[PDB]
């Protein structure tokens, strides 16, 4: 009965997108959708409107200590803007400044990202990856790294320094490199029918419309180092992060050291 | 030496930021019963030696003021 009434009150036509990508005729699929999908019972049966309650980001720390695991995973994330705010696009460029690194990368030492270069130069991590998840009016922007125990504290310091570099020492060169990387990411991802259809469905569900890729290029080209560094000062400086850990995480610091490291004393 | 101190398995710790919590969350109304509980649990082992030696001090000063008193 719970599955039945959940399917009844949640599978409704105004909250449904039928998306298609590829060798498709639009009029034929519109006719077939009018033939098949015109039976939804969209009327509110119990007049219960499911509204989006605005969630609150709480700066907290969960740690799961279990010392038999070979490697430790730590994720640190601050609150993101959301889908509707364009500033995450700028934050996307910020992730393209920080990038990602694995132990199987063929670049070696001369990678352009300074965190990846100091990770391979000092043998810090198995891997790290920068993520920006967005939800309705909220989100999580941050990093996730897997490493051995005896490096964890040190690597945290390096990661925080890179974030504060994005607050202060952003130059034209790494901003242009992040712009080019983000351009290659947003055009190279939309290859084949499945990711294009996924982009269409997620765009009509989140933004309410399909943003053209030329508009994405116009939004990407509008950023420079000044606005990137003031958005990074707006979203990273003197903020309360969320820390999750799993593995040999004894050297993973408390909330006080991380919170102190998320602001420099020189300014 | 954080990292090679002990071996603990399957434990979860939850904590908050100091900026999303109160510095004195129900200070007096939750602090007075705990202080009274600690005092009730420790005063029966701390106080009676101090009471006995206060009695010893008062007896000693009473004898010192009662030392001669113009003895008949």
């Amino acid at each position: 009965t719970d599955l039945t009434d959940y399917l009844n009150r949640h599978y409704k036509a105004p909250r449904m997108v039928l998306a298609a990508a590829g060798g498709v005729e639009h009029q034929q699929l519109l006719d077939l959708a009018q033939k098949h999908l015109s039976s939804v019972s969209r009327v509110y049966e119990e007049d219960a409107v499911p509204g989006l309650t605005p969630c609150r980001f709480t700066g907290s720390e969960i740690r799961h200590r279990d010392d038999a695991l070979p490697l430790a995973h730590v994720a640190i994330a601050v609150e993101g803007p959301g889908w509707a705010n364009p500033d995450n696009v700028t934050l996307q460029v910020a992730n393209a400044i920080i990038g990602h690194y694995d132990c199987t990368y063929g670049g070696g030492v001369h990678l352009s990202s300074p965190l990846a270069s100091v990770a391979v130069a000092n043998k810090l991590c198995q891997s790290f990856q920068t993520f920006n998840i967005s939800y309705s009016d909220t989100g999580l922007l941050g990093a996730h790294f897997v490493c051995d125990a005896m490096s964890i504290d040190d690597m945290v310091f390096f990661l925080q320094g890179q974030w504060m570099r994005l607050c202060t020492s952003a130059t034209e060169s790494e901003v242009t490199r992040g712009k080019n990387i983000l351009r290659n990411a947003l055009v190279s991802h939309l290859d084949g029918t499945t990711p294009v259809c996924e982009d269409i469905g997620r765009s009509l569900l989140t933004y309410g419309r399909r943003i053209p890729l030329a508009e994405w290029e116009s939004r990407i080209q509008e950023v420079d180092a000044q606005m990137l560094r003031d958005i990074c000062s707006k979203y990273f400086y003197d903020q309360c992060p969320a820390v999750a850990g799993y593995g040999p995480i004894e050297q993973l610091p408390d909330y006080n050291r991380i919170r102190s490291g998320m602001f420099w004393l020189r300014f | 030496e954080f990292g090679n101190l002990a071996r603990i398995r399957h434990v979860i710790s939850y904590s908050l930021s100091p900026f999303e919590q109160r510095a004195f969350p129900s200070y007096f109304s939750k602090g007075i019963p705990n202080v009274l509980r600690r005092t009730r649990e420790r005063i029966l082992r701390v106080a009676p030696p101090f009471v006995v030696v206060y009695l010893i001090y008062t007896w000693g000063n009473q004898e010192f003021e009662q030392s001669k008193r113009k003895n008949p």
Partner: peptide, 15 residues
């Protein structure tokens, strides 16, 4: 199961 856990209510400490 890691989905079986959730944070406790910190309502007496939170602002």
């Amino acid at each position: 199961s890691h989905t079986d856990v959730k944070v406790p209510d910190f309502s007496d400490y939170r602002r």
